Amino acid sequence: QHCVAEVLRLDPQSGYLKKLTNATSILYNTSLNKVMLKQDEEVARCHICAYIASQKMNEKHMPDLCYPKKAKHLMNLFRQSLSLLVKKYCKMTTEEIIRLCNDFELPREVAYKIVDEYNINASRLVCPWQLVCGLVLNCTFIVFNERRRKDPRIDHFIVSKMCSLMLTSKVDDVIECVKLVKELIIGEKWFRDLQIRYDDFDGIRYDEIIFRKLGSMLQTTNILVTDDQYNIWKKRIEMDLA
Amino acid sequence: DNTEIIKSFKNFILEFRLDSQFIYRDQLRNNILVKNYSLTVNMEHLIGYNEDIYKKLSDEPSDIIPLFETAITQVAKRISILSRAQSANSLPTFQLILNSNANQIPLRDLDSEHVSKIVRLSGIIISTSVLSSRATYLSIMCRNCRHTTSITINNFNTVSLPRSCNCGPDPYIIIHESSKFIDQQFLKLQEIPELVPVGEMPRNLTMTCDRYLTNKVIPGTRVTIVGIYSIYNGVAIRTPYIKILGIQSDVETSSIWNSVTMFTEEEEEEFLQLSRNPKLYEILTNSIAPSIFGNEDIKKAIVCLLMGGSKKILPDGMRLRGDINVLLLGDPGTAKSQLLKFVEKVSPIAVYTSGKGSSAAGLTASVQRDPMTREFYLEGGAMVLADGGVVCIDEFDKMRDEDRVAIHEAMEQQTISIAKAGITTVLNSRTSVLAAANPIYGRYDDLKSPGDNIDFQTTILSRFDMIFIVKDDHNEERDISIANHVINIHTGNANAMQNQQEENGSEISIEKMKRYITYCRLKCAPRLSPQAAEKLSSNFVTIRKQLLINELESTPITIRQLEAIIRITESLAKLELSPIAQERHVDEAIRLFQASTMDAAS
Amino acid sequence: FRKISRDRGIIDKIISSMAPSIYGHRDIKTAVACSLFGGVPKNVNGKHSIRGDINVLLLGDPGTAKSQILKYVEKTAHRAVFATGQGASAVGLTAS
Ligand SMILES: Nc1ncnc2c1ncn2[C@@H]1O[C@H](COP(=O)(O)OP(=O)(O)O)[C@@H](O)[C@H]1O
Ligand SMILES: Nc1ncnc2c1ncn2[C@@H]1O[C@H](COP(=O)(O)OP(=O)(O)O)[C@@H](O)[C@H]1O
Ligand SMILES: [Zn+2]
């Protein structure tokens, strides 16, 4: 039942969940009662089980359910028993770029946004590797400012990652990949919502920069260090005896 | 995350303290001078300091342990350089060690739950199989590419070699001369035979260990252990086993000849207060048998005995037996059995037996062969278990002749030899002996000959330097005296409390005297004076000419009883830590031997 | 237990109720009744030990019941045993 609920709640990755666990139960039951249905490794035995249980209740969905040789076999058997940017004009899918975005373990909402961007504005293109590259980079720089604000060892590792995920030794093209999308995507309300959420504004806060730029000297350029820093740095030399 | 836990752990290293003194910090600082690369730990000490590691090390230990190892190595690396900057390249992982006392759970109450967790327990040991080795770091070259690489392994003493770096599969040779390894062994266990069902044979279990948690143990040593109920490989099934992560032994169960010899310093001063008292001898006589009555003269020999005597060697090899040999002789009652029960307690590393050998006990070396490879090994011996010790016997009467012979040889040279088919032995006994008698129907032997107990009329008056008729003839009041001496033992503890207040005064308890004995047994360098020479040559010729007549009257004398008091006198002076001797105790010498000649008459 | 133990000399009723296998005789029943309970051991501060537990030895002609009540006691005790010598024995009365 644990494994049943596991594989059944593996579909997302009201009446649905209930009726589907009941379905898989009595389905597996019917399939194992008689002596007719054998040599079926339990390795895989809760999948077109789940697909036909989708087919049964009320509404069914061909996509995102089967997601192979024996998949067809067992189906019939049960059903009877009952570089990257020089490349010109490439093509992509939903899950291709879900992969290239989920490699950073970023959320799926940002990915859906880049997907919407694409399927509306993937029309007039030369190469979508550039656009989606720049997109997910300017997702990373905006959401990952904290860890980077304290760890400048990150910005080399990250750019190195996407330099070789798309197979180049030259990188200034990637720099352009970022600034051009930033020129493009600059002013949409959803981009706006993300900037108020994760608070980069060029990577710097609002309540600081406005005094940086309106015309002030109270502007806190933190050359000096904060108090808790020293409060914890002192422990390193406390035990200096050893 | 994991580094949060690493810091929660590493703060416990140098930021823990109790009784206002750092504990583990300087423990490591010492261990590294020892060049030990390990430690000791309690886990009781971690519960109050922090609860962020306990509840997760419990149920996911292996997930957490090598972290601690690496944290430890991290602390090491700073302190290594800092101490090199202080005074005066290759620093591997340090085995961690720990222990606990929270509880003990038996093998019987296990199940297939709480598996891979950590459990506490009791049991008894068998195995000492072999030092089986494993790897830790081993270099690899390809045979075609000549493409060097390297591998290191961590805990499991998961993966194998690389299947491909054309060279094909298996392209790799393992180099040894620049490779590294470690040792383990396969250690068994089985429960308390006293806490078992009436019926069935017992159940045992294997386990494994590593570098410095090795070779701690030898069988029979009851031990408690804590470990991880791990697994390796009917229908479909895997073998249950355990991984050690904590061992604790009784400090020294069955008496180890490889004992302690470097005593502490605080004890020397009271030792030498007791060296310099004049009451030494009299205290020891007041205290060796505090719940025991009379026979002062008998208790006055044991102290001559336990301290041994003149280990004297000469350039041929004809040593003299550094110790002395003794024989009680007498009836029921008269404490002949109780002292012998006692003496093992006061004893550091000596042994007790009955006669004929005891159950599964060779009274001498009962050699046999190996369960594996069918090879020869010297097994046992009640006369060699106790090398450098006393031996206690009761029922000397019913020997076997083969059993009697070698023991009959020990008490004059203390070296057994066995030369059966293939093995040729000279195994050193080097022991002292306490006997005990069975007079036939008791008392009428004084009316009769010296002997007329058993058919060794020879060895009695020959191989013995202390032989005593041990009885009083039912004096109507000695009975009451000994009875009221002893009745208070059983309740009221007045006989015990008297020893309490007299140890508060001038007496000594069991172990202080034990250590005194051990120390002087191995320390002293005695000798006797030329001046004391003639004193007993005169006694000897006189006792000779004396009993010449009275034994020529148709009623023994040996060079050995001559040579015996030579060494008893040195013992009683030894008590005062005497590199020389005078008549002060030579008078007591014949004062005490005269009992033997009086018995010699009758 | 305490109610009856303290009330007027149980022990006649002990030997009345020890082992009704045979009508037999009261004296050796009494001896082994002492053998049942065990006494108390002590040591004078961990030396001069005393044995608290009790021993027995019976003998006589085989015509009377000698191998009965001991097996009864095996049935009646806690952590008793019926071992034997060679033949019809649980174990050989040693360790090995
Ligand atoms: N000289 C003695 N003084 C006091 N108690 C004794 C003496 N001799 C024996 N006992 C006591 O009587 C009991 C019998 O032991 P013991 O006489 O040593 O064995 P055995 O009678 O077989 O030689 C022991 O419990 C012991 O405490
Ligand atoms: N007084 C008795 N009442 C009933 N049966 C008896 C009586 N005495 C002896 N028996 C029977 O005779 C047997 C005597 O056996 P026993 O003498 O114990 O054999 P062994 O001497 O070989 O142990 C017992 O098994 C018992 O059943
Ligand atoms: Zn290769």
XYZ file of N, CA and C in Angstrom, chain A residues 37-227:
573
model
N -2.178 -14.871 -15.837
C -1.297 -13.721 -16.059
C -0.034 -13.789 -15.213
N 1.037 -14.333 -15.791
C 2.291 -14.611 -15.093
C 3.493 -14.129 -15.922
N 4.696 -14.291 -15.364
C 5.944 -13.692 -15.861
C 5.774 -12.218 -16.179
N 5.437 -11.508 -15.124
C 5.197 -10.080 -15.166
C 5.948 -9.561 -13.946
N 7.180 -9.091 -14.158
C 7.993 -8.634 -13.041
C 7.271 -7.507 -12.338
N 7.173 -7.610 -11.013
C 6.606 -6.519 -10.230
C 7.458 -5.258 -10.284
N 8.662 -5.342 -10.862
C 9.560 -4.232 -11.151
C 8.768 -3.085 -11.755
N 7.842 -3.416 -12.647
C 7.132 -2.440 -13.457
C 5.621 -2.507 -13.267
N 5.068 -3.331 -12.376
C 3.610 -3.597 -12.415
C 2.515 -2.678 -11.878
N 2.717 -1.377 -12.024
C 1.740 -0.395 -11.590
C 1.853 0.802 -12.521
N 1.753 0.565 -13.828
C 1.924 1.657 -14.770
C 0.893 1.745 -15.860
N 0.757 0.759 -16.743
C -0.458 0.833 -17.549
C -1.634 0.358 -16.720
N -1.374 -0.296 -15.585
C -2.375 -0.388 -14.536
C -2.954 0.998 -14.267
N -2.065 1.969 -14.011
C -2.498 3.335 -13.758
C -3.031 4.011 -14.999
N -2.516 3.656 -16.166
C -3.028 4.302 -17.363
C -4.468 3.895 -17.665
N -4.795 2.608 -17.557
C -6.177 2.205 -17.808
C -7.060 2.648 -16.657
N -6.523 2.694 -15.440
C -7.325 3.263 -14.376
C -7.594 4.749 -14.604
N -6.721 5.447 -15.337
C -7.071 6.782 -15.822
C -8.173 6.706 -16.866
N -8.037 5.764 -17.797
C -9.053 5.535 -18.821
C -10.443 5.234 -18.269
N -10.527 4.658 -17.073
C -11.817 4.242 -16.508
C -12.722 5.276 -15.815
N -12.250 5.859 -14.714
C -13.034 6.801 -13.897
C -13.947 7.813 -14.622
N -13.365 8.769 -15.344
C -14.151 9.805 -16.040
C -13.378 10.517 -17.159
N -12.293 11.193 -16.793
C -11.444 11.871 -17.744
C -10.095 11.193 -17.768
N -9.551 11.127 -18.962
C -8.276 10.515 -19.239
C -7.422 11.521 -19.981
N -6.122 11.294 -19.913
C -5.136 12.177 -20.516
C -4.054 11.328 -21.147
N -4.022 11.194 -22.475
C -2.889 10.537 -23.117
C -1.483 11.116 -22.733
N -1.284 12.469 -22.678
C 0.074 12.899 -22.347
C 0.360 12.747 -20.864
N 1.654 12.687 -20.548
C 2.141 12.759 -19.171
C 1.630 11.618 -18.288
N 1.174 10.508 -18.881
C 0.725 9.342 -18.128
C 1.618 8.143 -18.378
N 1.869 7.791 -19.637
C 2.785 6.693 -19.920
C 4.234 7.066 -19.618
N 4.506 8.338 -19.310
C 5.870 8.838 -19.236
C 6.595 8.476 -17.952
N 9.675 0.165 -22.604
C 8.536 0.555 -23.440
C 8.080 -0.563 -24.338
N 8.940 -1.552 -24.546
C 8.626 -2.664 -25.418
C 7.413 -3.398 -24.887
N 7.547 -3.948 -23.694
C 6.457 -4.647 -23.047
C 5.345 -3.736 -22.577
N 5.537 -2.419 -22.588
C 4.440 -1.529 -22.234
C 3.246 -1.788 -23.128
N 3.537 -2.005 -24.399
C 2.533 -2.322 -25.393
C 2.080 -3.752 -25.236
N 3.030 -4.641 -24.968
C 2.711 -6.052 -24.901
C 1.724 -6.257 -23.780
N 2.118 -5.865 -22.577
C 1.286 -6.050 -21.409
C -0.023 -5.313 -21.562
N -0.015 -4.157 -22.228
C -1.273 -3.469 -22.471
C -2.228 -4.366 -23.230
N -1.797 -4.833 -24.398
C -2.650 -5.701 -25.196
C -2.970 -6.988 -24.461
N -2.020 -7.488 -23.678
C -2.199 -8.776 -23.036
C -3.238 -8.703 -21.939
N -3.187 -7.644 -21.142
C -4.227 -7.412 -20.162
C -5.560 -7.130 -20.828
N -5.565 -6.226 -21.798
C -6.812 -5.815 -22.421
C -7.500 -6.971 -23.123
N -6.741 -7.980 -23.555
C -7.389 -9.196 -24.019
C -7.760 -10.083 -22.841
N -6.973 -10.043 -21.760
C -7.245 -10.921 -20.632
C -8.581 -10.590 -19.990
N -8.926 -9.307 -19.968
C -10.130 -8.828 -19.318
C -11.377 -9.351 -20.026
N 29.475 23.965 -32.015
C 28.858 24.417 -30.780
C 27.346 24.401 -30.908
N 26.667 25.067 -29.981
C 25.214 25.049 -29.918
C 24.552 26.245 -30.574
N 25.260 27.366 -30.698
C 24.709 28.573 -31.297
C 25.156 28.851 -32.724
N 26.251 28.258 -33.198
C 26.462 28.239 -34.642
C 25.413 27.383 -35.351
N 24.863 26.372 -34.675
C 23.800 25.550 -35.248
C 22.554 26.368 -35.533
N 22.156 26.378 -36.797
C 21.056 27.190 -37.287
C 19.749 26.404 -37.307
N 18.699 27.019 -36.757
C 17.318 26.536 -36.804
C 17.176 25.138 -36.193
N 17.376 25.098 -34.885
C 17.223 23.890 -34.090
C 15.797 23.867 -33.553
N 15.432 22.756 -32.932
C 14.089 22.558 -32.417
C 14.129 22.039 -30.991
N 13.110 22.412 -30.222
C 13.033 22.052 -28.820
C 11.595 21.740 -28.446
N 11.450 21.242 -27.225
C 10.206 20.769 -26.657
C 10.030 21.306 -25.252
N 8.901 20.933 -24.663
C 8.650 21.254 -23.272
C 9.702 20.605 -22.390
N 9.849 19.295 -22.504
C 10.703 18.598 -21.563
C 12.193 18.694 -21.867
N 12.585 18.994 -23.106
C 13.993 19.271 -23.388
C 14.513 20.428 -22.521
N 13.769 21.533 -22.467
C 14.229 22.671 -21.680
C 13.799 22.548 -20.227
N 12.797 21.723 -19.916
C 12.611 21.364 -18.516
C 13.866 20.692 -18.004
N 14.488 19.842 -18.816
C 15.766 19.269 -18.404
C 16.826 20.348 -18.236
N 17.023 21.175 -19.266
C 18.115 22.147 -19.166
C 17.897 23.188 -18.070
N 16.679 23.327 -17.552
C 16.427 24.197 -16.410
C 16.442 23.455 -15.080
N 15.956 22.216 -15.051
C 15.930 21.366 -13.876
C 17.310 20.831 -13.525
N 18.313 21.029 -14.393
C 19.688 20.700 -14.016
C 20.204 21.558 -12.870
N 19.651 22.755 -12.674
C 19.964 23.586 -11.518
C 19.010 23.353 -10.349
N 18.108 22.370 -10.443
C 17.073 22.117 -9.436
C 16.203 23.350 -9.194
N 16.128 24.257 -10.173
C 15.213 25.369 -10.079
C 13.784 24.873 -10.048
N 12.874 25.692 -9.552
C 11.478 25.282 -9.522
C 10.935 25.111 -10.925
N 9.726 24.574 -10.967
C 9.020 24.342 -12.212
C 8.241 25.561 -12.696
N 7.972 26.538 -11.827
C 7.187 27.701 -12.233
C 7.978 28.590 -13.175
N 9.202 28.914 -12.781
C 10.148 29.597 -13.655
C 10.311 28.872 -14.992
N 10.389 27.542 -14.958
C 10.506 26.775 -16.193
C 9.274 26.931 -17.073
N 8.088 26.920 -16.468
C 6.872 27.105 -17.246
C 6.823 28.488 -17.854
N 7.358 29.472 -17.144
C 7.409 30.822 -17.684
C 8.317 30.893 -18.906
N 9.507 30.289 -18.826
C 10.382 30.266 -20.002
C 9.707 29.503 -21.135
N 8.906 28.497 -20.800
C 8.212 27.717 -21.816
C 7.160 28.562 -22.518
N 6.437 29.369 -21.753
C 5.443 30.260 -22.330
C 6.113 31.274 -23.239
N 7.186 31.892 -22.736
C 8.025 32.775 -23.539
C 8.362 32.138 -24.871
N 8.837 30.901 -24.823
C 9.208 30.201 -26.039
C 8.008 30.047 -26.961
N 6.980 29.328 -26.511
C 5.941 28.886 -27.430
C 5.137 30.057 -27.977
N 5.254 31.239 -27.375
C 4.699 32.434 -27.992
C 5.714 33.086 -28.912
N 6.966 33.171 -28.486
C 7.982 33.945 -29.180
C 9.122 33.063 -29.652
N 8.839 31.794 -29.951
C 9.800 30.942 -30.642
C 9.589 30.949 -32.145
N 9.124 32.070 -32.686
C 8.590 32.126 -34.038
C 9.568 32.728 -35.030
N 10.298 33.755 -34.607
C 11.088 34.603 -35.490
C 12.582 34.377 -35.293
N 12.974 33.136 -35.056
C 14.226 32.859 -34.380
C 15.376 32.618 -35.334
N 16.562 32.570 -34.735
C 17.760 32.046 -35.362
C 18.265 30.811 -34.628
N 18.285 30.854 -33.295
C 18.756 29.748 -32.474
C 18.165 29.861 -31.070
N 17.328 28.924 -30.606
C 16.748 29.064 -29.267
C 17.689 28.712 -28.135
N 18.826 28.084 -28.421
C 19.777 27.826 -27.352
C 20.220 29.135 -26.710
N 20.418 30.185 -27.512
C 20.747 31.488 -26.942
C 19.655 32.009 -26.037
N 18.418 32.030 -26.528
C 17.364 32.651 -25.750
C 17.171 31.915 -24.436
N 17.098 30.585 -24.488
C 16.822 29.862 -23.254
C 18.039 29.870 -22.336
N 19.250 29.880 -22.905
C 20.467 30.084 -22.126
C 20.376 31.355 -21.302
N 20.223 32.488 -21.990
C 20.117 33.756 -21.302
C 18.998 33.760 -20.282
N 17.871 33.142 -20.629
C 16.728 33.097 -19.731
C 17.088 32.436 -18.416
N 17.582 31.207 -18.483
C 17.798 30.486 -17.243
C 18.987 31.080 -16.484
N 19.934 31.720 -17.186
C 21.003 32.424 -16.475
C 20.450 33.578 -15.654
N 19.540 34.360 -16.224
C 18.949 35.472 -15.495
C 17.827 35.038 -14.568
N 17.520 33.749 -14.544
C 16.811 33.166 -13.407
C 17.789 32.867 -12.273
N 18.939 32.303 -12.611
C 19.897 31.966 -11.575
C 20.448 33.204 -10.879
N 20.884 34.206 -11.633
C 21.496 35.366 -10.989
C 20.522 36.101 -10.084
N 19.226 35.994 -10.354
C 18.232 36.691 -9.550
C 17.849 35.884 -8.322
N 17.723 34.564 -8.440
C 17.295 33.806 -7.272
C 18.483 33.453 -6.363
N 19.695 33.314 -6.917
C 20.885 32.866 -6.191
C 21.785 34.008 -5.729
N 21.215 35.156 -5.400
C 22.068 36.258 -4.977
C 22.589 36.069 -3.552
N 21.835 35.387 -2.682
C 22.249 35.211 -1.290
C 23.545 34.433 -1.202
N 23.534 33.229 -1.773
C 24.688 32.369 -1.641
C 25.845 33.026 -2.354
N 25.573 33.725 -3.452
C 26.655 34.406 -4.137
C 27.115 35.632 -3.364
N 26.171 36.346 -2.721
C 26.555 37.508 -1.918
C 27.543 37.150 -0.843
N 27.519 35.913 -0.374
C 28.501 35.508 0.614
C 29.576 34.610 0.030
N 29.383 34.090 -1.180
C 30.341 33.201 -1.833
C 30.573 33.610 -3.278
N 31.525 34.509 -3.508
C 32.028 34.782 -4.857
C 32.762 33.621 -5.526
N 32.942 32.477 -4.865
C 33.475 31.304 -5.558
C 32.412 30.658 -6.448
N 31.176 31.161 -6.425
C 30.072 30.552 -7.153
C 30.089 30.964 -8.619
N 30.267 32.258 -8.872
C 30.122 32.819 -10.210
C 31.063 32.210 -11.231
N 32.177 31.626 -10.806
C 33.028 30.913 -11.750
C 32.499 29.512 -12.015
N 32.041 28.840 -10.961
C 31.559 27.467 -11.071
C 30.313 27.428 -11.955
N 29.417 28.401 -11.780
C 28.147 28.418 -12.507
C 28.361 28.664 -13.994
N 29.127 29.700 -14.321
C 29.412 29.979 -15.719
C 30.215 28.857 -16.352
N 31.093 28.204 -15.596
C 31.788 27.048 -16.141
C 30.818 25.923 -16.442
N 29.829 25.732 -15.572
C 28.822 24.713 -15.811
C 28.116 24.958 -17.132
N 27.540 26.145 -17.307
C 26.809 26.349 -18.553
C 27.726 26.576 -19.753
N 29.027 26.794 -19.548
C 29.957 26.869 -20.669
C 30.162 25.521 -21.331
N 30.130 24.446 -20.548
C 30.404 23.115 -21.055
C 29.153 22.283 -21.166
N 28.056 22.716 -20.562
C 26.804 22.048 -20.839
C 26.413 22.283 -22.288
N 26.837 23.420 -22.861
C 26.600 23.741 -24.262
C 27.897 23.742 -25.070
N 28.972 23.184 -24.515
C 30.163 22.785 -25.259
C 30.871 23.955 -25.951
N 31.399 24.883 -25.154
C 32.262 25.928 -25.701
C 33.448 26.177 -24.786
N 34.574 26.533 -25.402
C 35.701 27.089 -24.665
C 35.660 28.610 -24.641
N 35.038 29.230 -25.644
C 34.808 30.669 -25.662
C 33.496 30.953 -24.935
N 33.438 32.108 -24.271
C 32.350 32.416 -23.346
C 31.730 33.793 -23.532
N 32.404 34.735 -24.190
C 31.850 36.076 -24.266
C 30.518 36.078 -24.995
N 30.337 35.157 -25.943
C 29.009 34.900 -26.489
C 27.982 34.641 -25.390
N 28.375 33.954 -24.312
C 27.427 33.716 -23.222
C 27.123 35.017 -22.515
N 28.135 35.863 -22.390
C 27.908 37.181 -21.808
C 26.846 37.916 -22.614
N 26.949 37.818 -23.932
C 25.946 38.440 -24.776
C 24.608 37.745 -24.584
N 24.638 36.422 -24.400
C 23.413 35.658 -24.188
C 22.656 36.179 -22.995
N 23.370 36.706 -22.010
C 22.686 37.243 -20.848
C 22.186 38.656 -21.130
N 23.072 39.537 -21.605
C 22.674 40.946 -21.671
C 21.617 41.198 -22.736
N 21.549 40.360 -23.764
C 20.567 40.590 -24.812
C 19.173 40.200 -24.360
N 19.038 39.044 -23.720
C 17.748 38.724 -23.130
C 17.377 39.773 -22.115
N 18.357 40.336 -21.423
C 18.009 41.326 -20.426
C 17.524 42.595 -21.094
N 18.103 42.918 -22.244
C 17.557 43.962 -23.096
C 16.139 43.649 -23.546
N 15.819 42.375 -23.725
C 14.551 41.997 -24.334
C 13.401 41.846 -23.344
N 13.651 41.164 -22.239
C 12.632 40.653 -21.329
C 12.440 41.664 -20.219
N 12.837 42.893 -20.493
C 13.228 43.780 -19.427
C 12.044 44.258 -18.617
N 10.856 44.267 -19.202
C 9.790 45.078 -18.657
C 8.423 44.446 -18.595
N 8.367 43.147 -18.357
C 7.101 42.441 -18.276
C 6.725 42.291 -16.814
N 5.413 42.347 -16.529
C 4.887 42.302 -15.168
C 5.276 41.060 -14.396
N 5.519 39.961 -15.094
C 5.916 38.751 -14.382
C 7.391 38.809 -13.996
N 8.256 39.194 -14.937
C 9.632 39.547 -14.614
C 9.690 40.504 -13.423
N 8.786 41.483 -13.426
C 8.638 42.442 -12.334
C 8.328 41.735 -11.027
N 7.403 40.786 -11.085
C 6.990 40.057 -9.902
C 8.162 39.269 -9.341
N 8.975 38.694 -10.225
C 10.147 37.962 -9.760
C 11.180 38.889 -9.134
N 11.369 40.070 -9.713
C 12.335 41.001 -9.144
C 11.919 41.523 -7.772
N 10.619 41.731 -7.543
C 10.153 42.050 -6.189
C 10.223 40.841 -5.267
N 10.133 39.633 -5.810
C 10.197 38.435 -4.980
C 11.598 38.220 -4.428
N 12.569 38.064 -5.316
C 13.905 37.605 -4.972
C 14.944 38.715 -4.958
N 14.573 39.931 -5.362
C 15.219 41.171 -4.931
C 16.699 41.214 -5.316
N 16.918 41.286 -6.628
C 18.242 41.603 -7.151
C 18.391 43.097 -7.415
N 17.601 43.634 -8.346
C 17.725 45.005 -8.826
C 19.187 45.332 -9.112
N 19.686 44.642 -10.132
C 21.087 44.640 -10.523
C 21.929 43.856 -9.522
N 21.283 43.104 -8.634
C 21.896 42.406 -7.526
C 22.017 43.167 -6.227
N 21.317 44.292 -6.073
C 21.455 45.153 -4.905
C 20.073 45.575 -4.432
N 19.935 45.791 -3.133
C 18.619 46.095 -2.605
C 18.161 47.516 -2.946
N 16.859 47.712 -2.736
C 16.153 48.940 -3.069
C 16.474 50.027 -2.069
N 16.275 49.713 -0.795
C 16.447 50.692 0.256
C 17.890 51.159 0.373
N 18.828 50.482 -0.287
C 20.201 50.942 -0.404
C 20.415 51.757 -1.667
N 20.066 51.180 -2.820
C 20.436 51.805 -4.086
C 19.792 53.166 -4.267
N 18.578 53.368 -3.750
C 17.953 54.661 -3.994
C 18.759 55.769 -3.335
N 19.334 55.505 -2.169
C 20.263 56.454 -1.574
C 21.625 56.391 -2.223
N 21.944 55.299 -2.904
C 23.193 55.265 -3.651
C 23.156 56.298 -4.753
N 21.997 56.447 -5.368
C 21.866 57.116 -6.648
C 21.096 58.424 -6.607
N 20.263 58.701 -5.601
C 19.533 59.972 -5.579
C 20.495 61.127 -5.362
N 21.564 60.852 -4.628
C 22.556 61.862 -4.317
C 22.942 61.867 -2.844
N 23.501 60.766 -2.340
C 23.861 60.704 -0.930
C 25.201 60.146 -0.541
N 25.550 60.510 0.684
C 26.759 60.074 1.330
C 26.380 59.151 2.456
N 25.117 59.171 2.896
C 24.784 58.109 3.839
C 24.777 56.715 3.201
N 24.856 56.655 1.871
C 24.887 55.391 1.148
C 25.948 54.462 1.715
N 25.514 53.272 2.119
C 26.369 52.347 2.853
C 27.068 51.437 1.864
N 28.258 51.845 1.452
C 29.159 50.953 0.745
C 29.861 50.149 1.828
N 29.530 48.868 1.952
C 29.985 48.101 3.109
C 31.416 47.616 2.900
N 32.332 48.581 2.887
C 33.735 48.231 3.029
C 33.977 47.714 4.432
N 33.506 48.459 5.426
C 33.506 47.963 6.785
C 32.688 46.679 6.852
N 32.795 46.010 7.983
C 32.208 44.704 8.157
C 31.143 44.836 9.232
N 30.268 43.853 9.305
C 29.186 43.882 10.267
C 29.639 43.346 11.620
N 28.819 43.609 12.642
C 29.216 43.286 14.009
C 29.227 41.780 14.262
